[PDB]
Design a protein around this motif. Structure first.
Motif, PDB file in Angstrom:
ATOM      1  N   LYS A   1     -79.173  15.697  35.142  1.00 55.62           N
ATOM      2  CA  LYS A   1     -79.121  15.594  33.677  1.00 55.62           C
ATOM      3  C   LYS A   1     -77.920  16.409  33.205  1.00 55.62           C
ATOM      4  CE  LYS A   1     -81.491  16.812  29.481  1.00 55.62           C
ATOM      5  NZ  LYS A   1     -82.741  17.074  28.730  1.00 55.62           N
ATOM      6  N   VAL A   2     -77.101  15.792  32.365  1.00 58.48           N
ATOM      7  CA  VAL A   2     -76.032  16.501  31.686  1.00 58.48           C
ATOM      8  C   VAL A   2     -76.582  16.926  30.333  1.00 58.48           C
ATOM      9  CG1 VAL A   2     -73.630  16.426  30.854  1.00 58.48           C
ATOM     10  CG2 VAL A   2     -74.162  15.227  32.893  1.00 58.48           C
ATOM     11  N   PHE A   3     -76.723  18.231  30.108  1.00 62.64           N
ATOM     12  CA  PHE A   3     -77.241  18.719  28.833  1.00 62.64           C
ATOM     13  C   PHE A   3     -76.147  18.708  27.776  1.00 62.64           C
ATOM     14  CE2 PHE A   3     -81.427  20.770  29.041  1.00 62.64           C
ATOM     15  CZ  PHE A   3     -81.665  20.608  30.388  1.00 62.64           C
ATOM     16  N   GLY A   4     -76.568  18.524  26.507  1.00 62.28           N
ATOM     17  CA  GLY A   4     -75.737  18.898  25.356  1.00 62.28           C
ATOM     18  C   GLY A   4     -75.664  20.407  25.240  1.00 62.28           C
ATOM     19  N   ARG A   5     -74.635  20.903  24.588  1.00 63.17           N
ATOM     20  CA  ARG A   5     -74.512  22.339  24.382  1.00 63.17           C
ATOM     21  C   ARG A   5     -75.750  22.946  23.708  1.00 63.17           C
ATOM     22  NH1 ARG A   5     -72.625  25.247  20.023  1.00 63.17           N
ATOM     23  NH2 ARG A   5     -71.845  23.394  18.924  1.00 63.17           N
ATOM     24  N   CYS A   6     -76.045  22.480  22.493  1.00 67.92           N
ATOM     25  CA  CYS A   6     -77.171  23.038  21.755  1.00 67.92           C
ATOM     26  C   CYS A   6     -78.498  22.707  22.437  1.00 67.92           C
ATOM     27  CB  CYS A   6     -77.173  22.606  20.234  1.00 67.92           C
ATOM     28  SG  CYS A   6     -75.742  23.232  19.333  1.00 67.92           S
ATOM     29  N   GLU A   7     -78.567  21.587  23.116  1.00 65.12           N
ATOM     30  CA  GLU A   7     -79.802  21.234  23.823  1.00 65.12           C
ATOM     31  C   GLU A   7     -80.061  22.241  24.932  1.00 65.12           C
ATOM     32  OE1 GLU A   7     -79.513  17.669  26.042  1.00 65.12           O
ATOM     33  OE2 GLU A   7     -81.734  17.550  26.429  1.00 65.12           O
ATOM     34  N   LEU A   8     -79.020  22.614  25.682  1.00 61.28           N
ATOM     35  CA  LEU A   8     -79.225  23.674  26.728  1.00 61.28           C
ATOM     36  C   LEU A   8     -79.538  25.043  26.158  1.00 61.28           C
ATOM     37  CD1 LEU A   8     -79.285  24.280  29.785  1.00 61.28           C
ATOM     38  CD2 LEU A   8     -76.801  24.634  29.611  1.00 61.28           C
ATOM     39  N   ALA A   9     -78.851  25.426  25.074  1.00 60.92           N
ATOM     40  CA  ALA A   9     -79.176  26.656  24.380  1.00 60.92           C
ATOM     41  C   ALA A   9     -80.616  26.714  24.027  1.00 60.92           C
ATOM     42  CB  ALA A   9     -78.284  26.878  23.133  1.00 60.92           C
ATOM     43  N   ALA A  10     -81.151  25.644  23.447  1.00 67.84           N
ATOM     44  CA  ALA A  10     -82.590  25.609  23.066  1.00 67.84           C
ATOM     45  C   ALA A  10     -83.504  25.725  24.259  1.00 67.84           C
ATOM     46  CB  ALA A  10     -82.903  24.340  22.286  1.00 67.84           C
ATOM     47  N   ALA A  11     -83.192  24.983  25.333  1.00 70.83           N
ATOM     48  CA  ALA A  11     -84.006  25.031  26.566  1.00 70.83           C
ATOM     49  C   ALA A  11     -83.915  26.441  27.199  1.00 70.83           C
ATOM     50  CB  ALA A  11     -83.482  23.986  27.570  1.00 70.83           C
ATOM     51  N   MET A  12     -82.707  27.012  27.243  1.00 72.11           N
ATOM     52  CA  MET A  12     -82.565  28.411  27.740  1.00 72.11           C
ATOM     53  C   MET A  12     -83.374  29.436  26.936  1.00 72.11           C
ATOM     54  SD  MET A  12     -78.636  28.579  28.969  1.00 72.11           S
ATOM     55  CE  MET A  12     -78.281  28.310  30.714  1.00 72.11           C
ATOM     56  N   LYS A  13     -83.303  29.263  25.615  1.00 71.86           N
ATOM     57  CA  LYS A  13     -84.061  30.095  24.675  1.00 71.86           C
ATOM     58  C   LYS A  13     -85.579  29.997  24.908  1.00 71.86           C
ATOM     59  CE  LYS A  13     -84.355  31.200  19.703  1.00 71.86           C
ATOM     60  NZ  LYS A  13     -84.646  32.605  20.030  1.00 71.86           N
ATOM     61  N   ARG A  14     -86.070  28.795  25.035  1.00 71.15           N
ATOM     62  CA  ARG A  14     -87.487  28.553  25.279  1.00 71.15           C
ATOM     63  C   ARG A  14     -87.912  29.148  26.619  1.00 71.15           C
ATOM     64  NH1 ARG A  14     -91.229  25.257  27.539  1.00 71.15           N
ATOM     65  NH2 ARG A  14     -89.792  24.111  28.883  1.00 71.15           N
ATOM     66  N   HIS A  15     -87.031  29.103  27.621  1.00 66.75           N
ATOM     67  CA  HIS A  15     -87.409  29.711  28.895  1.00 66.75           C
ATOM     68  C   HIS A  15     -87.128  31.207  29.001  1.00 66.75           C
ATOM     69  CE1 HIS A  15     -88.931  26.177  30.890  1.00 66.75           C
ATOM     70  NE2 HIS A  15     -87.845  25.508  30.572  1.00 66.75           N
ATOM     71  N   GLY A  16     -86.867  31.873  27.878  1.00 67.66           N
ATOM     72  CA  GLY A  16     -86.799  33.359  27.827  1.00 67.66           C
ATOM     73  C   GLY A  16     -85.451  34.010  28.204  1.00 67.66           C
ATOM     74  N   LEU A  17     -84.358  33.265  28.183  1.00 64.36           N
ATOM     75  CA  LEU A  17     -83.032  33.861  28.506  1.00 64.36           C
ATOM     76  C   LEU A  17     -82.304  34.620  27.389  1.00 64.36           C
ATOM     77  CD1 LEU A  17     -81.262  31.333  30.825  1.00 64.36           C
ATOM     78  CD2 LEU A  17     -82.134  33.546  31.527  1.00 64.36           C
TER      79      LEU A  17
END
Length: 129
Positions: A1-17
């Motif tokens: 999967k190629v993430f979007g910038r903001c999409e990865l930020a959100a996923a990183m945020k949700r996983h506690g980074l």
């Protein structure tokens, strides 16, 4: 999967980074940009015969098992292929151990050379988080 910038930020945020061990979310997004171009399936072979896997290019020398890195460890207790999934959970959990190991994000050479000392906040600019 190629993430979007903001999409990865959100996923990183949700996983506690976001601020994990003091590293704001922009650090992680910038690191992923230059490591993998946000592509979970990124792989790169190193000179020592180890391989880097996933969005944060986690290495088989120390951190995951790929069955083909003589004399390596598997400190995240995972197959390296789990770092290629569209689910970034394994990458995130393993990155948390890596960044806790004493050198912080300097463990990621591209973070040190392309992100460290830069305006990393720009990488989350405009994102709904």
């Amino acid at each position: 999967k190629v993430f979007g910038r903001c999409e990865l930020a959100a996923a990183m945020k949700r996983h506690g980074l976001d601020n994990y061990r003091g590293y704001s979310l922009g650090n992680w997004v910038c690191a992923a940009k230059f490591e993998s171009n946000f592509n979970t399936q990124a792989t790169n072979r190193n000179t020592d015969g180890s391989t880097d896997y996933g969005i944060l290019q986690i290495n088989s020398r120390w951190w995951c098992n790929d069955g083909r890195t003589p004399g390596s460890r598997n400190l995240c207790n995972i197959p390296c292929s789990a770092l290629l999934s569209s689910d970034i959970t394994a990458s995130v959990n393993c990155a948390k151990k890596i960044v806790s190991d004493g050198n912080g994000m300097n463990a990621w050479v591209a973070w040190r050379n392309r992100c460290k000392g830069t305006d990393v906040q720009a990488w989350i600019r405009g994102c709904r988080l």
